[PDB]
Short mmCIF file of C-alpha atoms in Angstrom, two decimals:
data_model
loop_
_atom_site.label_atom_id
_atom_site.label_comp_id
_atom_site.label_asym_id
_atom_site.label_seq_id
_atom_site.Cartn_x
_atom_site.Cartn_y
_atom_site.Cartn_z
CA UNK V 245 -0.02 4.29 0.53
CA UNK V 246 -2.75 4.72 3.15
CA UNK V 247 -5.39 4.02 1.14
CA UNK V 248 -6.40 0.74 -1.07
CA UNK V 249 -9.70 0.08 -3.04
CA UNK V 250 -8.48 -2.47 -5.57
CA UNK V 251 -11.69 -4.69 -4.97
CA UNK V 252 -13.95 -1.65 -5.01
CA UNK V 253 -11.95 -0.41 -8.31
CA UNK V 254 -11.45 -3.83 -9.83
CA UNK V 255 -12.59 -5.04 -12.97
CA UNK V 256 -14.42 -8.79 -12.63
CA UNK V 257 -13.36 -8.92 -16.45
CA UNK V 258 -9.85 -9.08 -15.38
CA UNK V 259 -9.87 -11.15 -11.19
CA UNK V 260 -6.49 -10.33 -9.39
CA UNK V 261 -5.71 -14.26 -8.40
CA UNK V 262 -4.97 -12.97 -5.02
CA UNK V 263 -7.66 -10.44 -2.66
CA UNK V 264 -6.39 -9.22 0.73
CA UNK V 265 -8.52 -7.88 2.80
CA UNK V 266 -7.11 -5.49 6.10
CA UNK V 267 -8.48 -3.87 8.72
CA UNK V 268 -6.56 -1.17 10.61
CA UNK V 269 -6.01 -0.39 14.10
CA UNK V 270 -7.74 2.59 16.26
CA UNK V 271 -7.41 6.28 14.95
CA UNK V 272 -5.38 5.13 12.24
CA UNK V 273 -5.84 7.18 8.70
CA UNK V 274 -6.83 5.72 5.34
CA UNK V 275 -8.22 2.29 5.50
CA UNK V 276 -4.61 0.64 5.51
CA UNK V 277 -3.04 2.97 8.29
CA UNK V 278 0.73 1.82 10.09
CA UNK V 279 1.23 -1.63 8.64
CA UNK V 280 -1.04 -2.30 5.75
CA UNK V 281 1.13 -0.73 3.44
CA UNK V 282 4.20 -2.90 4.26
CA UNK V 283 2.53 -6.19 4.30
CA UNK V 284 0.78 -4.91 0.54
CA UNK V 285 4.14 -4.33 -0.57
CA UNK V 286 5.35 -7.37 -0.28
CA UNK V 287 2.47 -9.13 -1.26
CA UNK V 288 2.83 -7.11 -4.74
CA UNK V 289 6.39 -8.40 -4.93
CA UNK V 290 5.33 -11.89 -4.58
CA UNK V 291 2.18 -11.84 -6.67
CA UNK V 292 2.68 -8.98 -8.85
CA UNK V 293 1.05 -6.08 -9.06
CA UNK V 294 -1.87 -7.53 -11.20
CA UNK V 295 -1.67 -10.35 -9.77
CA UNK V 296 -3.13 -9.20 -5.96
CA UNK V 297 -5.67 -6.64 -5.30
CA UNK V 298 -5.30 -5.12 -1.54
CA UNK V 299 -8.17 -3.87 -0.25
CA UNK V 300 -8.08 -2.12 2.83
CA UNK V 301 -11.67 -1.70 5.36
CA UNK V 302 -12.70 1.55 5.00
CA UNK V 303 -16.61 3.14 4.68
CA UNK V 304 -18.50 2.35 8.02
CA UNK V 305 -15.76 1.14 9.67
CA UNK V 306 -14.10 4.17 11.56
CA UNK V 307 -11.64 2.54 13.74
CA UNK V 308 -13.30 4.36 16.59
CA UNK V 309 -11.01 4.04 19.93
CA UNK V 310 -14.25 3.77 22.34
CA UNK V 311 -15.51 0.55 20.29
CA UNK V 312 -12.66 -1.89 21.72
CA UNK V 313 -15.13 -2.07 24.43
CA UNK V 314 -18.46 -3.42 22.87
CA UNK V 315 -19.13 -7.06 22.99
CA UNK V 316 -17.05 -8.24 19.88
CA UNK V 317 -14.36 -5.19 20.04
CA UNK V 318 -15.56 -3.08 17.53
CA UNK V 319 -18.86 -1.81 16.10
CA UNK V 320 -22.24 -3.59 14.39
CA UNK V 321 -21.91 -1.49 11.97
CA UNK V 322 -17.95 -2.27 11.11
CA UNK V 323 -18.67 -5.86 11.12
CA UNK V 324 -21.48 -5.25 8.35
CA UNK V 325 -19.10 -3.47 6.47
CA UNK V 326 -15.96 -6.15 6.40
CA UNK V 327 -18.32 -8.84 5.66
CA UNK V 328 -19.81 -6.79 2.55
CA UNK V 329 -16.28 -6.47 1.12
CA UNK V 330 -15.68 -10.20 1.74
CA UNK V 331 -19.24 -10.62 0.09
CA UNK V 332 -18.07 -8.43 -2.72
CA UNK V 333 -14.75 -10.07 -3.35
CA UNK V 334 -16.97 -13.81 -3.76
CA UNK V 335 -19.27 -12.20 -6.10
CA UNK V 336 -16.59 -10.22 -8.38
CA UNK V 337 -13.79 -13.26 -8.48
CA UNK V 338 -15.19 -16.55 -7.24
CA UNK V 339 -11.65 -18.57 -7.88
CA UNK V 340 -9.36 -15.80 -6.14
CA UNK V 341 -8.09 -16.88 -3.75
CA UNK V 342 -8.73 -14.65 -0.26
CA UNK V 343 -6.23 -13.80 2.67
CA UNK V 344 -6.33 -11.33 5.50
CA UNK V 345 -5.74 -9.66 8.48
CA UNK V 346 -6.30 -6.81 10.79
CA UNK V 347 -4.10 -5.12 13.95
CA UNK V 348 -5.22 -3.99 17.22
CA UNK V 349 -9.72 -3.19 16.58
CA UNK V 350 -8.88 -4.58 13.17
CA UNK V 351 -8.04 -7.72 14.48
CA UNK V 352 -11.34 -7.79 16.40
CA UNK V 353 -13.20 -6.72 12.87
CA UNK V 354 -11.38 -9.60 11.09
CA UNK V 355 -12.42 -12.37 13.64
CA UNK V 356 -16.06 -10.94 14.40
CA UNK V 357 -16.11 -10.90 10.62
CA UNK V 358 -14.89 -14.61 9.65
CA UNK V 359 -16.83 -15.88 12.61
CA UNK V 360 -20.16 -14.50 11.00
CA UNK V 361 -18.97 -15.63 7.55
CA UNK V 362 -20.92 -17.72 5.18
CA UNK V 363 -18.44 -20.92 5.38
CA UNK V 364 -18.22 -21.69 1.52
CA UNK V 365 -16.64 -17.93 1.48
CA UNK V 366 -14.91 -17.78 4.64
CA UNK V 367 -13.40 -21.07 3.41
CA UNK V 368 -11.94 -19.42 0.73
CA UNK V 369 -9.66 -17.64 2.82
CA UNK V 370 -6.14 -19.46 2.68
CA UNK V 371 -4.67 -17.52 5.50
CA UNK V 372 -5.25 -14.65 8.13
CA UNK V 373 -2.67 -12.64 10.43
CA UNK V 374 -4.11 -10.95 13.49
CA UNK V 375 -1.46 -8.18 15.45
CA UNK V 376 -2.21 -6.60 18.66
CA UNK V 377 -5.37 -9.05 18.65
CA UNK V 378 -7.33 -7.60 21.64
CA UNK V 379 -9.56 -10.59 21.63
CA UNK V 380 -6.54 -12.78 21.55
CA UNK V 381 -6.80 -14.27 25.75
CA UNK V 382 -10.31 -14.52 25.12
CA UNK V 383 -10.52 -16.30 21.77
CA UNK V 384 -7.68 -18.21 22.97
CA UNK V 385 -5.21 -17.09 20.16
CA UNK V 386 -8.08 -18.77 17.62
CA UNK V 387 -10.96 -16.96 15.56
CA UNK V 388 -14.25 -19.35 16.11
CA UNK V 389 -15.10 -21.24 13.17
CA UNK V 390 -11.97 -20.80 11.63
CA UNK V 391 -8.85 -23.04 11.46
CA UNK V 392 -5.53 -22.53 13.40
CA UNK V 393 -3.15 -23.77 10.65
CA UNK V 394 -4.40 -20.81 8.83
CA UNK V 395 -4.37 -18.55 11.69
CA UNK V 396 -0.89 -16.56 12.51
CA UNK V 397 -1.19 -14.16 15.96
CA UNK V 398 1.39 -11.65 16.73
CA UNK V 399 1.15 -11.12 19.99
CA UNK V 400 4.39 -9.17 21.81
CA UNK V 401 5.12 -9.58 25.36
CA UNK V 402 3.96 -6.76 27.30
CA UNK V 403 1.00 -5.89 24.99
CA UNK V 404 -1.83 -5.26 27.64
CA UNK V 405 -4.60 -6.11 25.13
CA UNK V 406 -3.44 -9.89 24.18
CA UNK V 407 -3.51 -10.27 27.85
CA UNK V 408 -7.15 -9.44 28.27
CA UNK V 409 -7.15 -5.69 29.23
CA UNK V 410 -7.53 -2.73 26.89
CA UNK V 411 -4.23 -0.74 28.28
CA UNK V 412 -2.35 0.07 25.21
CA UNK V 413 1.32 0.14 26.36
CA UNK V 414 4.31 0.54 24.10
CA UNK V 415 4.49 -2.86 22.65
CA UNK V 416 1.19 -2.67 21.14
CA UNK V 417 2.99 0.00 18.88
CA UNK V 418 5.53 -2.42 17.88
CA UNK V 419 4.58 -4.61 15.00
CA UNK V 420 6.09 -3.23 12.18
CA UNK V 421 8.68 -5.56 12.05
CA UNK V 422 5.97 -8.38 12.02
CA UNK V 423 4.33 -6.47 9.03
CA UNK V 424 7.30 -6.20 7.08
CA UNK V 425 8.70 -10.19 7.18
CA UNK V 426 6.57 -12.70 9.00
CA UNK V 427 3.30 -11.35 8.38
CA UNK V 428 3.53 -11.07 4.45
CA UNK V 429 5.93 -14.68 4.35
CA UNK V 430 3.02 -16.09 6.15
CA UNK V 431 0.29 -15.31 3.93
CA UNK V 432 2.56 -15.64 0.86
CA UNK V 433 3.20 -19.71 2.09
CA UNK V 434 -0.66 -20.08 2.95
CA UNK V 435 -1.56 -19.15 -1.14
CA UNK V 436 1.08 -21.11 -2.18
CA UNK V 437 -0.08 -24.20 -0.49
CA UNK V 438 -3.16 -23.55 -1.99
CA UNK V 439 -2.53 -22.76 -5.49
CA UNK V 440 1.03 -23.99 -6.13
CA UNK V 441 3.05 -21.37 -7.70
#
């Protein structure tokens, strides 16, 4: 549901092929919260339940509201803590393949994180969807260091924060149909390229 450790649980002896890591939006609950779930679903579906671990960004990060507004959109300390679990996944399963994502904050998180990224792990990651990216006018619609064939923004018109402001308006609350096809068929396509099938 809410709440996904399967890198933090996972046994090394036995790598998933497949390690998503997500970061939620602001105030949401367990370390998946509105639209992790639905994108880990389908994931599972397409990779099997063995074969993907989902682990969602929880310890320091806290998805505090006030943080959209430091420098990178989120916290030092949330930063440190995505890039630890990125960090961890590299150390447990060096030939898993990586993918992520993050919505609203989250999105920030993921592309402070994969900015700051040691490059032999960040690339590793085959594919990353951003929603509600607040950093999205700024960045223009890329994270730095990263490439944009394996970048996917969702962006709706009329979300304040892809725009440049931190206004959340109604369409920033309006991604779950993102999360439950494009999102996942995205990142499903992106592993495939990589690994065949």
């Amino acid at each position: 549901r809410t709440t996904r450790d399967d890198l933090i649980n996972g046994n090394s002896a036995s790598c998933a092929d497949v390690i998503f890591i997500y970061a939620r939006g602001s105030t949401e609950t367990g370390n998946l919260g509105t639209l992790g779930p639905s994108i880990a679903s389908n994931l599972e579906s397409a990779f099997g339940k063995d074969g993907v671990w989902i682990q969602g960004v929880g310890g320091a990060y806290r998805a505090t509201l006030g943080d959209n507004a430091l420098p990178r959109g989120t916290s030092s300390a949330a930063i440190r803590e995505m890039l630890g679990l990125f960090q961890q996944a590299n150390t447990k399963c060096p030939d898993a393949t990586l993918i992520a994502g993050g919505y609203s904050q989250g999105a920030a998180l993921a592309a402070a994180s994969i900015e700051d990224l040691d490059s032999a792990i960040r690339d590793k990651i085959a594919g990353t969807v951003l929603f509600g990216y607040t950093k999205n006018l700024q960045n223009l619609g890329r994270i730095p260091n990263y490439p944009a064939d394996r970048t996917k923004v969702f962006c709706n018109t009329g979300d304040l924060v892809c725009t440049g402001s931190l206004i959340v308006a109604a369409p920033h609350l309006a991604y779950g149909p993102d999360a439950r096809g494009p999102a996942p068929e995205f990142l499903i396509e992106k592993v495939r390229a990589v690994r065949g099938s």
